[PDB]
Structures are given as C-alpha cells and as structure tokens.
Design the sequence.
C-alpha cells in the first residue's frame, strides 16, 4: 500500500504578497468605463465541469 | 491499505497577504462606471457542476 | 508500494510578490475604456472541463 | 516500488517578483481604448480540457 | 524501483524579476487603441487539450 | 532501477530579469494602433494538444 | 540502471537580462500601426502538437 | 548502466544580455507600419510537431 | 556503460551580448513599411517536425 | 564504455557581441520598404525536419 | 510655522503638523528562533541504548532558546 | 515656514509639515535563526548506543539560539 | 521656505514640506542565520556508537546561533 | 526657497520641498549566513564510531552563526 | 531658489525641490556568506572512526559565519 | 537659480531642482563569499580514520566567513 | 542659472537643474570571493588517514573569506 | 547660464542643466577572486596519508580570499 | 552661455548644458583574479603521502587572493 | 558661447553644450590575472611523497594574486 509520511502538496495556491505605498498621489476621472488600481489575489482549482468564475472586479457589462 | 501519517494537502488556498498604505492621497470622480482600489483575496474549489461565481465586486450590469 | 517521505509538490502556484511605490504621482482621465494600474496575482489549476475564468478585472464588455 | 525522499517539483509556478517606483510621474488620457501599467503575475496548469482563461485585465470587447 | 532522493524539477516557471523606475516622466494619449507599459510575468503548463489562454492584458477586440 | 540523487532539471524557464530606468522622458500619441513599452517575461511548456496562448498584450484585433 | 548524481539540464531557458536607461528622451506618434520599445523575454518548450503561441505583443490584426 | 555525475546540458538557451542607453534622443512617426526598437530575448525548443510561434512583436497583419 | 563526469554541452545557445548607446540622435518617418533598430537575441533548437518560427518582429504582412 | 571527463561541446552558438555608438546622428524616411539598423544575434540547431525559421525582422511581405 | 489652507472647494482637507516622529510597524511578519520542523522517519527495527554514569546526556528532537543575562548557559554540562 | 494652499477647486487637499522623521517598517518579512527543517530518513535496521562517563554529550536533531550577555555559552561543556 | 500652491483646478493637491528624513523599509525580505534545511537519507543498516570520558561531544543535525557579548562562546568545550 | 505653482488646470499637483534625505529600502531581498542546504545521501551499510577522552569533538551536519563582541569564539575548544 | 510653474494646462504637475540626498536601495538582491549547498553522495559501505585525546576535532558538513570584534576566532583550537 | 516653466499645453510637467546627490542602487545583484556548492561523489567502499592528540583538525565540506576586527583569526590553531 | 521653457505645445516637459552628482548603480551584477563549485568524483575504494600530534591540519573541500583588520590571519597555524 | 527653449511644437521637451557629474554603473558584470571551479576526477583505488607533528598542513580543494589590513596573512604558518 | 532653441516644429527637443563630466561604465565585463578552472584527471591507482615536522605545507588545488596593506603575505611560511 | 538653433522643421533637435569631459567605458571586456585553466591528465599509477622539516613547501595546481602595499610578499618563505 501507499505511504505518505510528512508529505506536502500545493495545487492552485497563492502565497506571500506584500505591498507598500508611501506618500503617493492619485487622481482619477472616470466616465462609463472601468478603472482598477488595487491588490488582487485569486486562486482557483476546478476538478471538472464548466462556467466557474472565481473573481470579477471593476467591470462594466452592457450586453444587448 | 493506504497510510497518511503527518501528511498535508492544500487545494485552492490563498495565504499571506500583507498591505500597507502610509500618507497616501486619492481623489476619485466616477460617473456610471466602476472603480476598484481595495485588497481582494478569493479562493475557490469546485468538484463538479457549473455556474459558480465565488466573488463579484465593483460592477455595473445593464443588460437588455 | 509507493512511499512519499518528506516530498513536496507545487502545481499552479504564485509565491513572493513584493511592490513598493514612494512619492509617485498619477493622473488618469478615462472615457468608456479600461485603465488598470494595480498588483494582480492569479493562480489556476484545472483537471478537466472548460469555460473556467479565474479572474477578470478592469474590462468593458458591450456585445451585440 | 517508487520512493520519493525529500523530492521537490514545480509546474506552472511564478516566484520572486520585486518592483519599485520612486518619484515617478504619469499622465494618461484614454478614450474608448485600453491602457495597462501595473504588475501582473499569472500561473496556470491545465491537465486537459479547453476554454480556460486564467486572467484577463484591461480589455475592451465590443463583438457584433 | 525508481528512487528520487533530493531531486528538483522545474517546468514552466518564471523566477526573479526585478524592476526599478526613479524620477521617470510618462505622458500618454490613446484613442481607441492599446497601450501597455507595465511588468508582466506569466507561466503556463498544459498537459493536453486546447484553447487555454493564460493571460490577456491591454487589448481591444471588435470582431464582426 | 533509476536513481536521481541531487539532480536538477529546467524546462521552459525564465530567470533573472533586471531593469532600471532613471530620469527618462516618454511621450506617446496613439490612434487606433498598439504601443508597448514594458517588461514582459513569459514561460510556456506544452506536452501535447494545440491552441494554447500563454500571453497576449497590447493588441488590436478587428477581424471581419 | 541509470544514475543521475548532481546532474543539471536546461531546455528552453532564458537567464540573465539586464537593461538600463538613463536620461533618455523618446517621442512617438502612431496611427493604426505597431510600435514596440520594451524588454521582452520569452521561453518555450513544446513536446508535441501544434498551434502554440507563447507570446504576442504590440500587434494590429485586421483579417478579412 | 549510464552514470551522470556533475554533468551539465544547455539546449535552446539565451544567457547574458546587457544593454545601456544614456542621453539618447529618439523621434518616431509611424503610419500603418511597424517600428521596433527594444531588447528582445527569445528561446525555443520543440521536440516534434509544427505551428509553434515562440514570440511575435510589432507586426501589422492584414490578410485577405 | 557510458560515464559523464563534469561534462558540458551547448546546442543552440546565445550568450554574452553587450550594447551601449551614448548621446545618439535618431529620427524616423515610416509609412506602411518596417523599421527595426533594436537588440534582438534568438536561440532555437528543433529535434524534428516543421513550421516552427522562433521570433518575428517588425513586419508588415498583407497577403491576398 | 565511453568516458567524458571535463569535455565541452558547442554546436550552433553565438557568443561575445559588443557594440558601442557615441554621438551618432541618423535620419531615415521610409515608404513601403524595409530599413534595418540594429544588433541582431541568432543561433539555430535543427536535428531534422523542415520549415523552421529562427528569426525574421524588418520585412514587408505582400504575396498574391 | 507650518500652514495649510483650502478654500472654495466642494470637498476639502487642510492638515498641518510640526515636528513628527514615526514608529516601528510589523505587518504579516514571521520570526523563528530555535525551531525544529518537518522531521519524518520510517524504520522497521529500532534499538536505542543510553548508559550514563555521573555525566550529562541530551538526546532526541530538541529545540532550545536560552537567554542568560549573567552566568553560564549550556545545553549539557558536567562539572566534577 | 512650509506653506500649502489650494483654492477654487471642486476637490482639494492642502497639506503642510515641518520637520519629519520616518520609522522602521516590516511588511511580509521572514527571519530564521537557529532553525532546522526538512529532515527525512528511511532505514531498515538502526542501532544507536551512547556511553558517557563524567562528560557532556549532545545528540539528535537540535536547534539552539543562545544569547549570553555576560559569561560563557556552550552547547556541551565538561570542566573537571 | 517651501511654498506650494494650486489654483483654478477641478482637482488639486498642494503639498509643502521642510526638512524630511526617511526610514528603513523591508518588504518581502528573507534572512537565514544558522539554518539547516533539506537533508535526506536512505540506508539499510546503520550503527552509531559514541564513547565519551570527561570530554564534550556534539553530533547529529545541529543549528546554532550564539551571540555572546562578553565571555567565550563554543559549541563544544572541554577544559581540564 | 523652493516654490511650485500650478494654475488654470483641470487636474493639477503642486509639490514643494526643502532639504530631504532618503532612507534604506529592501524589497524582495534574500540573505544567507551560516547555512547548509541540499544534502542527499544513499548508502547500504554505515558504521560510525567516535571515542573522545578529555577533548572536544563536533560532527554531523552543522550550521553556526557566532558573533562574540569580546572574548574568544570557537566551534570546538580543548584547553588543558 | 528653485522655481517650477505650469499654467493653462488640462493636466499639469509642478514640482520644485532644494537640496536632496538619495539613499540605498536593494531590489531582488541575494547574498550568501558561509554557505554550503548541493552535496550528493552515493556509497555502499561507509566506515568512519575518530579518536581524539585532549584535542579539538571538527568534521562533517559545516558552515560557519563568525564575527569576533575583539579576541581570537577559530573553528578548532587546542591550547595546552 | 534653476527655473522651469511650461505654458499653453494640454499636458505639461515643470520640474526644477537645486543641488542633488544620488545614492547606491542594487537591482537583481548576487554576491557569494565563502561558499561551497555542487559537490557530487560516487564510491563503493569508503574508510576514513582520524587520530588527534593535543592538536587541531578540521575536515569535511566546510565554508567559513570570518571577520575579526582585532585579534588573530584561524581555521585551525594549535598553540602549545 | 539654468532655465528651461516650453510653450504652445500639446504635450510639453520643461526640466531644469543646477549642480547634480550621480551615484553607484549595480544591475544584474555577480561577484564571487572564496568560492568552490563544481567538484565531481567517482571512485571504487577510498582510504584516508590523518594523524596529528600538536599541530594544525585542514583538509577536504574548503572555502574561506577572512578579513582581519588588525592581527594575523591564517588558515592553519601551529605556534609552539 | 544654460538656456533651452522649445516653442510652437505639438510635442516638445526643453531641458537645461548646469554643472553635472556622472557616477559608476555596472550592468551585467561578473567578478571572480579566489575561486575554484570545474574539478573532475575518476579513480579506482585512492590512498591518502598525512602525518603532522608540530606543523601546519593544508590540503584538498581550497579557495581563500584574505584581506589583512595590518599584520601577517598566511595560508599555513608554523612558527617555533 | 550655452543656448539651444527649436521653433515651429511638430516634434522638437531643445537641450542645453554647461560643464559636464562623465563617469565609469561597465557593461557585460568579466574579471578573474586568482582563479583555477577546468582540471580533469583520470587515474587507476593514486598514492599520496605527506610528512611534515615543524614546517608549513600547502597542497592540492588552491586559489588565493591576498591583499595585505601592511605586513608580510605568504602562502606558506615557516619561521624558526 | 555655443549656440544651436533649428527652425521651420517637422522634426528638429537643437543641442548645445559648453565644456565637456568624457569618461571610461568598458563593454564586453575580459581580464585575467593569476589564473590557471585547462589542465588535463591521464595516468595509470601515480605516487607522490613530500617530506618537509622546518621549511616551506607549496605544490599542486595553484593560482595566486597578491598585492602587498608595504612589506614582503612571497609564495613560500622560510626564514631561520
């Protein structure tokens, strides 16, 4: 039989994200559009199937 | 038979996200759009099926 | 049988992302478009299937 | 049988991304287009199947 | 049987990307086009199948 | 049987990319075209199959 | 049997790319074309199959 | 059996590319063409198959 | 059996490319053509098969 | 059996390319043609097969 | 002295400050000192025998973090 | 003195400051001192025998982080 | 003195500052001192015998991080 | 003194500053001192015997990071 | 003094500064001091015997990073 | 003094600065001091015997990085 | 003094500066001091015997990086 | 003084500067000092015997990088 | 003084500068000092014997890079 | 003084400069000092014997790069 002593496994992982912002100046003017300027960390693992969205941020959907 | 002694497994995990913002200035003016500027951490694991949205932030949906 | 003593495995992983911004000035003016200017870390692992979007940020979809 | 003692494996990994921006000035004016100017780290691993988008940022889709 | 003692393997990996920008000035004016000027790190590994896009940034798709 | 003691293997890897820009001035004016001027690091490894795009940045697709 | 003690192998690798730009001035005016002026590092390894594009940047596709 | 003690192998590798640009002035005016003026490092290794493009930058495709 | 102790092999490699440009002035005016004026390093190794393009930069394809 | 102790082999390699340009002035005016004036280093090694282009830069293809 | 002033604004913020001194900050930081982790073993037959006479013996997995301000620190000490 | 002033703006921010001194910051930083990790072993028959008389013996996996301000620090010490 | 001023703007920011001194910053940095990692072993029959008389003996996997301000630091010391 | 001024702009930023001194910054930096990593071994029969009398002996995988400000630092010391 | 001024612009930035002094920066830098890595061994029969009397002996894989400000530093020292 | 000025521009940037002094920068740089890497061995029968009396002996894979400000530094020292 | 001025431009940049002094920069640079790498060996039967009496002996793979400011530095030293 | 001026341009850049002094730059540069690399050996039977009495002996693969500011530096030294 | 001026241009650049002094630059440069590389050997039977009494002996592959500011530097020194 | 001027051009560049002094530049340059490379040997039976009494002996592959500012530099020195 199979033995697993002290074994580690990572699948779809995100680890260690550091960010710093000192004395920064930002000016935005948006009209009917998207503007994104932030930290985003996403991890997904799908065994089977379809139509799985892990994350959706800052979007403008206007389908017809 | 199978033995698992002291074994570890990660699947779809997000770990360790650090952020700092000191003395920052931001000015935003939005009209009918999306603006995102924040920390976002998302983790998903789907065995099967479909149509599974883990997270949706800062969006403007106007379907017809 | 198979033995796994002290074995490690990474599949679809993102690790160690550091960012710093000191005394930076940014001015944006968007009209009906996309502007992205932020840290983004994404990790995916799909065994089978289709139609799996891990992350979607700063977009403008106007299908007809 | 197979033995794995102290063995390591990386597949689809992104590791160690450092960025610094000091005293930088940026001015953007966008009309109905895309402008991207940010750190992006993406890692994917697909065993089988199709139609898997790991990340999509700063886009303008207007299909007919 | 096969033994793997202290063995390492990298497949589709991106490691060690450093960037610095001091006292830089940039001015952009875009109309209905794409402009990209940011760090991008992407890693992919596909065992089989098709139609797998790891990353898509700063694009303008207007199919008919 | 095969032994692998302390053996290393790299396949599709990108490692060590350093960039510096001090006191640089850039002025761009784009109309309905593509302009790219940023660091890009991409690594791919495909065992079999087809139609796999690792990265696509700064493009303007208008098929008919 | 085969032994691999302390053996190294590189296949499709890109390593060590350094770039510096001090006090440089650039002025671009594009109309419906492509202009590229940035660091790009790409590494690919394909065992079999076809239709695999590792990277595509700064292009204007208008097929009919 | 075959022994590999301390053996090294490179296949399709690019290593050591250094570039410097001090006090340079460039002025470009493009109309419906391609202009490329940046560092590009590409490495490919294909065991078998066809239709594999490692990198494509600064192009204008208008097939009929 | 074959022994490989401390043996090295290079196949399709590019190594050591240094470039400097001080106080240079360039003025370009392109109409519907290609102009290339940048460092390019490319390395390929193909065991078998066909239709493998390692790199394509600064081109204008208008087939009929 | 064959022994390889401390043996080196180069096949298809390009090594050591240095370039300097100080106080140079260039003025180009292109119409529907190709102009190339940059460093280019290319290395190829093909075991068998056909139709393998390592690099193509600054070209204008208009087949009928 | 420092002076700040915002006028005729829909949104405004005026901040002024004299002498200032920042402090230490630790966000998401890890520190290990004297730690042992990840020890895996597989055996069929193990025999261990220790025989001590008038001495000091330390054995097994062990982590220590001593901090002796005055005097002698030792893991094992045997002074006759 | 420092002076800042914003006028006739829909959004405005005026900040002024005199002497300033920043501090230390640690974000997402790791530090190891005296650490042992990743030790894997496979054996069939193990025999270990230690025989000490009037001495010091240290053995096995061990991590130590000593910091003796005054006096002598030693892992094993045997003074007759 | 420093003076900054923004006028007749929809969005404006005026910042002024006198003397300034930045501080240390550590983002995503790693440091190892006295560390042992990645030790793998495979054996069939292992025998280990230690025999100490009036001495110091250190053995096995070991990591140490000593910092003795005054006095003598030693891993193993045997003074008669 | 330094003076900055922006007028008649939809977006404007005026910044002014006198004396300034930057500080140290570490982003994504690694440092190893006294480290041992990647040690792999395969054997069939191992025998190890140590026999010490009135001396110092150090053996096995070992990492040390000593920093003695005043006094003598030694891994193994045997003074009669 | 330094003076900067932007007028009649849709987007403008005026920055002025007097004396300035930059600082050290480390981005993505690595440093090794006293390190041992990548040691692989394959054997069938190994025998090791050490016999010490009143001396110092150091053996095995070893990494050290000593920094003695005043006094004598030695890996192994045996003074009678 | 330095003076910069931009007028009648859709986008403009005016920067002025007096005395300036840049600092050190390290991006993607590596440094090794006292390092040992890549040691591979294959053997069938190994025998090692050391016999020390009142002396210093150092052996095996070893990396050292000593930095003695005042006093004598030595890997092995044996003073009678 | 230095003076720069841009007028009647859609995009403009005016920069002026007085005295300036650049600093050191290191991008993608490597440095080795006291390093040993790439040592491969194949043998069938190895015998090693060392016999020291009142002396200093150093052997095996060894890398050292000493930097003694005042006093004598030596790998092996044996003063009677 | 230096004067630069651009007028009536769609894109313009005016830069002016007084005294200027550049600094050192290192891009993609390598440096080795005291290094040993690429040593391969194949043997069937190896015998090595060292016998030291009251002397200094250094042997094996060795890399050293000494930098003694005041005092005598030596790899091996034996003063009676 | 220096004067530059561009007028009535779609794209223009005016640069002016007074005194200027360039600095050192190193791009893609290599330097070796005290290095040994590429040593290959094949043998069947090797015997090596060293016998030292009250002297200095250095042997094997060796690379050194000494830099003694004041005092005597020697690889091997034996002063009675 | 120097004067440059471009007028009525679609693209123009006017540059002017006073006193100027260039600096050293090294692109793709190599330098070796005290180096040994490419040493290959094949033998069947090798015997080496060294017997030193109160002297200095250096042997084997050796590279040295000494730089003694004041005092005597020697590879081997034996002063009675």
Sequence:
């Amino acid at each position: 039989g199979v033995l697993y002593v002290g074994s580690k496994t990572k699948e779809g992982v995100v680890h260690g994200v550091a960010t710093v912002a000192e004395k920064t100046k930002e000016q935005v003017t948006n009209v009917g559009g998207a503007v994104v300027t932030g930290v985003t960390a996403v991890a997904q693992k799908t065994v089977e199937g379809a139509g799985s969205i892990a994350a959706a941020t800052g979007f403008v959907k206007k389908d017809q």
